Amino acid sequence: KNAEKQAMEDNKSDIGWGSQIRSYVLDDSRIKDLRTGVETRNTQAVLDGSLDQFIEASLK
RNA sequence: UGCCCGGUGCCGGAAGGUCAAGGGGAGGGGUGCAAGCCCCGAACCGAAGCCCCGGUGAACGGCGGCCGUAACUAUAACGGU
Ligand SMILES: [Mg+2]
Ligand SMILES: [Mg+2]
Ligand SMILES: [Mg+2]
Ligand SMILES: [Mg+2]
Ligand SMILES: [Mg+2]
Ligand SMILES: [Mg+2]
Ligand SMILES: [Mg+2]
Ligand SMILES: [Mg+2]
Ligand SMILES: [Mg+2]
Ligand SMILES: [Mg+2]
Ligand SMILES: [Mg+2]
Ligand SMILES: [Mg+2]
Ligand SMILES: [Mg+2]
Ligand SMILES: [Mg+2]
Ligand SMILES: [Mg+2]
Ligand SMILES: [Mg+2]
Ligand SMILES: [Mg+2]
Ligand SMILES: [Mg+2]
Ligand SMILES: [Mg+2]
Ligand SMILES: [Mg+2]
Ligand SMILES: [Mg+2]
């Protein structure tokens, strides 16, 4: 079980520079999902929970 | 060649507590007609030892447990008890 866990951990990104999926450039009000990829402009509405947008389009 | 002198040992301590014989003799008893004779007997004085106060490990010896915590993981330098 631990062996399968370490397989996950070492295959689990790094939370680092250039390892990412979103911009919250709140200095020009975008939140971009670089993967499908959409561009909502109503930023502090995403933090409210409008994730449906990205999710529904990211399930392709 | 570390840390622990609380227990044991040894060392030191004219205080204090306890402490035997002995000293003392408040008081009581037996007997005698009596002087007397004889027997218990409190306070208090009275050593070492022990208690008590310290020291001492190349003296006898003894040198822990639980819980949480770091780059998604393991561990825990760190903390709590
Ligand atoms: Mg607001
Ligand atoms: Mg000792
Ligand atoms: Mg000792
Ligand atoms: Mg000590
Ligand atoms: Mg012994
Ligand atoms: Mg002595
Ligand atoms: Mg004195
Ligand atoms: Mg004395
Ligand atoms: Mg006497
Ligand atoms: Mg006497
Ligand atoms: Mg006498
Ligand atoms: Mg008398
Ligand atoms: Mg009589
Ligand atoms: Mg008489
Ligand atoms: Mg003495
Ligand atoms: Mg030693
Ligand atoms: Mg020595
Ligand atoms: Mg011992
Ligand atoms: Mg020894
Ligand atoms: Mg952790
Ligand atoms: Mg973690």
Side-chain angles (χ1 to χ4, degrees), chain A residues 37-48:
Chain A
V38 194
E39 303 185 2
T40 302
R41 292 300 287 260
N42 197 327
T43 52
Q44 271 166 317
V46 164
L47 301 177
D48 290 350

Side-chain angles (χ1 to χ4, degrees), chain A residues 6-43:
Chain A
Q6 311 310 326
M8 283 167 56
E9 306 301 315
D10 198 354
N11 299 359
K12 184 196 289 291
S13 68
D14 68 347
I15 318 106
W17 300 92
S19 176
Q20 32 146 355
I21 58 174
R22 283 178 185 169
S23 302
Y24 305 26
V25 55
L26 303 178
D27 292 344
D28 67 20
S29 292
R30 250 177 286 145
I31 290 170
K32 296 176 67 177
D33 180 9
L34 53 89
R35 186 181 57 191
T36 83
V38 194
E39 303 185 2
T40 302
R41 292 300 287 260
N42 197 327
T43 52

